Amino acid sequence: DHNYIENMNEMCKKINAKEKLIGWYHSGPKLRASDLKINELFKKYTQNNPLLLIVDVKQQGVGLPTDA
Amino acid sequence: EIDTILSTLRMEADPSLHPLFEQFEKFYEEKLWFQLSESLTKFFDDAKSTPLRLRLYDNFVSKFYDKINQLSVVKYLLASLKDSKDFDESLKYLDDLKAQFQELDSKKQRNNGSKDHGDGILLIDSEIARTYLLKNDLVKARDLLDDLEKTLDKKDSIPLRITNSFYSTNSQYFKFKNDFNSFYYTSLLYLSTLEPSTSITLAERQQLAYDLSISALLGDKIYNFGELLHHPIMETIVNDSNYDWLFQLLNALTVGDFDKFDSLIKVQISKIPILAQHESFLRQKICLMTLIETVFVKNIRMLSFEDISKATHLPKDNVEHLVMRAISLGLLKGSIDQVNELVTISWVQPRIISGDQITKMKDRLVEWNDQVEKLGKKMEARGQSIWV
Amino acid sequence: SLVKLFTTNELMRWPIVQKTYEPVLNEDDLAFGGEANKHHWEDLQKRVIEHNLRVISEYYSRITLLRLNELLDLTESQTETYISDLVNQGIIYAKVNRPAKIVNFEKPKNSSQLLNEWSHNVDELLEHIETIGHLITKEEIMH
C-alpha cells in the first residue's frame, strides 16, 4: 500500500527529522528475484540506494542472522 | 506533398521492398503511431544499404517526428549517416535535430505526464564527437567524450544502446591513436553491453574482430582470451576466411607451442603489413604466456631457469633477461637468485578459468579440509574436562 | 622515447643507449652541444648505470658480481667502486665479497620483521574465505 509509506514517513519526519526513508527490510528466510522488483518500487522513494536488510527473524544462522 | 515523395521511393524500390513503403502512407493516415514506428524500424535496419533512405528519412525526421518515440527518430538518422561518406552532410543534420528535441519537450512532457527526452541528447553528442574524429579533429572529440562521461555518472542507469554508443566512439578514438591496450579493454565493454538493435551483422563482427585480435597479439599483458570466445563476436563465427589464419594464431598461443607459431607467422608476415613490422612483439608475448602458466599449475612456486629455458624454447641467456622484465611489468613478482639459477615467485597473476584448472582448485580445498578435521578431534580430547 | 626509458625499470644497456642518441642529441645544441658539455655525454654513463643498479638490487637478492659487470656494461674495477658509492650514500645496502664472486643485496631484517609479515598472511586468508561464502550464497538464488 504505496500511499501508506508516504504518510507514515510524513509523521516521523515531524517526530525527528534525522529519520528518512532508507529502504526496506525483508524477513527472509532467504533473498529472491522478487525482492529485485520490490527493490525497484522502494527506489523511487529513496534518494539513496535502498538498503535491503535481510533480517532472518528465526535466527537460524550460527553467527550473524542479519545480512546487509 | 508527402505522397509524391512516397511514389518516387516505390518506383525505385524492388517489388519486395514495396510493402514497407505502402505501410508508411496508410499507418500515418490511420494515426496508428505504434505501427508508424514499427514499419519504419524494419526499413532502416537493412534497407539503409540502399539510397532509398535519403529521401524517406530526412523528410520524415523533419516532419512527423513528434508522433513516434524520440529514440526511434535518432535511430534512423544514425542509419542514414552510417553509409553517408559526407561529413558536411552529417554535421548539418545533427545540429538541426537537436534544436527540434529542445522544442518538443515543452509540450510532450505535460501531455504524457512522464516521457524522457534526455536519450536523444547524449546520442547526438556521441555522433558529433565521432564525426570530428574521422575528420581528424581529435581535440574537439576528446573533450566531448569527457563531458558525456561526467553527465552519464549523474544518471543511475541508462539503456543498453546509450552506453554501447558511448563505448563505440571511444573505442574508435583509441585505435586511431594506436593505444592498443585501451582499444581492446573498451571493446570488451562494448560487446557485453551491446545494442539489441540488429544493425550488428556478421560482417560487422569480422571488421571488429581483426582489430581486437591484433591489439591483444602485440600486447605482453593481455590475457582475456577466455572472455573473447564467449562474446558474440567469435561465438557465432569462426568459419570465415579472416578467422582461419587469425584464429590459429590465437590457438597456438593458448597451447603454448612455439614450433607451430613460427610456421604460421612467416607466411602472415608478407600478407599482413602490421605483422611484418611488429615481429619482436609477437615472439615476446608467447614466451611470457607459457612461463606464467607453467608455474601456476604447479603447487611448487619455484622452478629453475633451465626448465623454463625448455618451456619457452629460448636459450638460458635470454630467459634470465625476460624474467627481469616480468618483474617490471608486475605480471610476476618474486626474487632472483643466480647462486642456484632459480626463480622463486611470491606472486602469480590469476590465469584464465578452464575446466582443467577448476579441478585442481577442488582438490586443494578438499586436502586442507582433512587437516582441519584431524586436528579439531585431537584438540577436543586433550583437555576434555575444561571447556567452561 | 628517451625520457620514459630512463624512468622505467627495464635494463638499459649503456653503449647501446649511447650509440642510438649519439649522432642526434649529443650534437643537439647547448646541453650537450657545448664544449664543456661534450663531457656531459660521457658523464651520462654514471647516470644510466646507477638507475639500473638501483632497480637490480631490488629484484635480485643474490647475483654473481661477474654477471653484473656485463649488464651494466662496465670495467669490473669501476663497477665495484660504484657499488661502494651507492652503499655509502645509503641509497642501497649491499654486502660485497671482494674477490668478485657474489654481490648480495641485503637490507636489514630482524626476527620481528619476518614474523610480522607472516602474521598478516594468516589473518588475510581467513577474511577472504569469509567474504567468498556470502557470494556463493548470492549466486545460488540468482540461478
Task: Pick from B336, B340, B345 the residue to mutate for testing the C interface (most C CBs within 10 Å).
Answer: B336
Residue B216 neighbours by CB under 8 Å, 6+ apart: B184, B222, B224, B225, B228
Structure letter (DSSP) for residue B332: E
Whether A31 sits inside 8 A of C141 (CB atoms) is yes
Shortest alpha-carbon distance between residue C143 and chain A (Å): 10
For residue B199, what is the DSSP state?
A: T
Those residues whose C-beta lies under 8 Å from the C-beta of residue A9, and which sit 6 or more positions away, are A20, A21
Neighbour count for residue A60 (Cβ, 10 Å): 8
| Residue B168 Ramachandran class (φ > 0 left, ψ -120 to 50 alpha, else beta) | alpha
Round to whole Å and give the CA distance between C141 and C143: 5
Q: Nine-digit cell at B94?
A: 545533427
Q: Is B261 helix (H, G, I), strand (E, B) or coil?
A: helix
The Cα B234–Cα B365 span in angstroms is: 34
- B335: β partners: B344
Residue of B301, B319, B335 to mutate, interface with C, max C Cβ within 10 Å: B335
Burial grade of B180 (CB within 10 A; 0-12, 13-18, 19 or more): buried
Residues 6+ apart with CB under 8 A from A6: A45
Question: CB within 8 A of C32, min separation 6: which ones?
Answer: C25, C26, C38, C40, C41
Query: Which residues sit opposite C63 in a β-bridge?
Result: C103
Q: What's the rounded Cα separation, in Å, for the pair B221 and C67?
A: 28
- DSSP notation for B84-96: ---HHHHHHHHHH
Burial C48-63 (b: 16+ CB within 10 A, else e): bbbbbbebbbebbbbb
B339 contacts chain C (CB < 8 A): yes
Give the whole-angstrom CA distance, residue A13 versus residue A20.
7
Nearest to C97 by CA among C55, C51, C65: C65
CB < 8 Å & 24+ apart, contacts of C91-96: C91/C54, C92/C53, C92/C54, C92/C57, C93/C57, C94/C57, C96/C65
Give, rounded to a whole angstrom, the gap between the first and last alpha carbons of chain B: 96
3-state secondary structure of B208: helix
- 3-class SS at B334? strand
A67 touches chain C (CB under 8 A): yes
Q: Subunits touching A (CB < 8 Å, at least 3 pairs)?
A: C
DSSP B313: T
CA distance B335 to chain C (A): 6
By the 8 A CB rule, do B318 and B284 touch?
no
**Type of residue numbered B234:** M
Distance CA B258, CA B312 (A): 8
> How was this structure obtained?
cryo-EM
Distance CA B155, CA B135 (A): 31
CA distance A46 to chain C (A): 24
Contacting partners of chain B (3+ CB pairs under 8 A): C
Among candidate residues B173, B72, B95, B165, the one with its CA nearest the CA of residue B126: B165
Nearest to A57 by CA among A48, A46, A65: A65
SS3 annotation, chain C: CHHHHHHCCCCCCHHHHHHHHCCCCCCCCCCCCCCHHHHCCCCHHHHHHHHHHHHHHHHEEEECHHHHHHHCCCCHHHHHHHHHHHHHCCCCCEEECCCCCCEEECCCCCHHHHHHHHHHHHHHHHHHHHHHHHHHHHHHHHC
Q: Is A31 on the interface with C (CB under 8 A)?
A: yes
Pairwise CA distance, residues B20 & B39, whole Å: 6
B90 with B131: CB under 8 angstroms? yes
Per the listing, cell 537460524 goes with A60
**CA–CA gap between residue B20 and residue B9 (Å, rounded):** 11
Q: What does the DSSP assignment read for chain A?
A: -HHHHHHHHHHHHHH-TT----EEEE--SS--SHHHHHHHHHHHH-SSPPEEEEE-SS---SS-SEE-
Give the Cα separation of B144 and B165 in Å (integer): 14
Instruction: Tell me how many helices (H) and strands (E) chain B has.
Output: 20, 3
Q: Which residues of A touch C142 (CB under 8 A)?
A: 33
Can you read off the three cell numbers belonging to residue B189? 565493454
CA distance A28 to C76: 74
Q: Does A37 touch chain C (CB under 8 A)?
A: no
Q: By the 8 A CB rule, do B291 and B313 touch? A: no
CB–CB contact C59 B336 (8 Å) = yes
- Domain boundaries, given as residue ranges, for chain B: 1-388
Q: Which three cell numbers stand for residue B90?
A: 552529417
How far, CA to CA in Å, does C141 sit from each of A49, B338, C60? 21, 53, 49
d(CA B72, CA B351): 43
Sign of the alpha-carbon torsion through B249, B223, B237, B230: positive
From chain C residues 78-137, the ones with a CB under 8 A of any chain A CB are 134, 137
Contact C72, C79 (CB under 8 A): yes
Q: How many CB atoms lie within 10 A of CB B285?
A: 19
Adjacent-strand bridge partners of A25: A53
Task: Please answer whether residues B73 and B120 qualify as being in contact, where contact means their C-beta atoms are separated by less than 8 angstroms.
Answer: yes
Q: How far is B368 from chain C (nearest CA, A)?
A: 13
Sheet containing B342-348, strands listed edge to edge, beginning at the edge strand earlier in sequence:
B302-304, B342-348, B332-337, C60-63, C103-105, C94-96
Determine the Cα–Cα distance for residues C143 and C135; give it in Å rounded to an integer: 13
Contacts of A33 in chain C (CB under 8 A): 141-142
Task: Record the cell numbers describing residue B332, joined without a space.
Answer: 610476476
